[PDB]
């Protein structure tokens, strides 16, 4: 496992480290959206930060399952439940939870 830059938006030098992590915070319970990204490993985007994505660039075809492990770095007193979903081909970006 290598760090996936889900938060691939900041681009100025002093903010580059912010791409390595994304936030969660107290909401208003409307099952709000936290983040999204394509699962395509050999495509431009977040996966480019991973060693998998890079090695993947030296091959034309790939096959197999992938895995993303999310580590929560909030305080010990913080709790919560998140729903992480994978939408197979054909399904557009889910409008809601």
């Amino acid at each position: 496992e290598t760090i996936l830059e889900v938060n691939n938006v900041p681009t100025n030098a002093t903010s580059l480290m912010e791409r390595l992590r994304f936030p969660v915070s107290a909401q208003a319970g409307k099952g709000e959206l936290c983040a999204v990204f394509r699962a395509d490993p050999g495509r431009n985007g977040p996966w480019q930060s991973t060693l998998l994505g890079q090695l993947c660039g030296y091959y034309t075809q790939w096959s197999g399952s992938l895995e993303v492990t999310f580590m929560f770095t909030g305080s010990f007193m913080a709790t919560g439940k998140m729903l992480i979903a994978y939408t197979p081909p054909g399904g557009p970006l889910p409008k809601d939870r």
């Binding site: 107290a26 319970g29 007193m77 913080a78 709790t79 439940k81 939870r97």
Partner: protein, 245 residues
Amino acid sequence: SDRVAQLTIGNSTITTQEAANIIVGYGEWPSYCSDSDATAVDKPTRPDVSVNRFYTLDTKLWEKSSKGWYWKFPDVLTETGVFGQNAQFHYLYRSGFCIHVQCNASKFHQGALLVAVLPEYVIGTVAGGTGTEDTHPPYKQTQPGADGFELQHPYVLDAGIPISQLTVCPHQWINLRTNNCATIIVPYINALPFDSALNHCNFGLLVVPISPLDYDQGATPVIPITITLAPMCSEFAGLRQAVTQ
């Protein structure tokens, strides 16, 4: 080792790190209808993984003044996913359910929800207050769909019966200082082997705060309660065109 758990069925997996075991209603697991209990002669369709999976249908906000809510089964799912389609295209239906109610807070919040399953949960009205009017609950109140419905008089469960005795039914409690979820497995309950998923609700799910939510000014005030459920051993028969009611 009893507080930690994983529920995997179909293409869905649930995890919890603060569970309080699992209740198997009336002590028995869901099963398919036997050849001697059955009566309808057509070969049933048993879709398996496409319908027996976890569906997260609704989220309610728990407040210091909340009264409690209820949902009806299989009503909550009749319009969702492949399960719903099967319930609409078929006259006959039967299945069990795995219910997982979620609610987490902090070690500084407090409160307790009673989560129970009540078969044949018939709703009554207040009879015009004086009890002289023979009113009846409207369709939207007897089969509230996925949004569920809020109890008007929780003490009598809107049906003239004491909530104090609701624990005689399969249940669990979500006591914030202890656990953050309730898991109840329910087998098919009816006096018939199969029935209409549209006309008849086999049971109701009740989530009622008995010990009110409380916390000090400054702690996260939005405490959601989410309902996730999975049909088990779903069977359908009597195929024709789709019907919503």
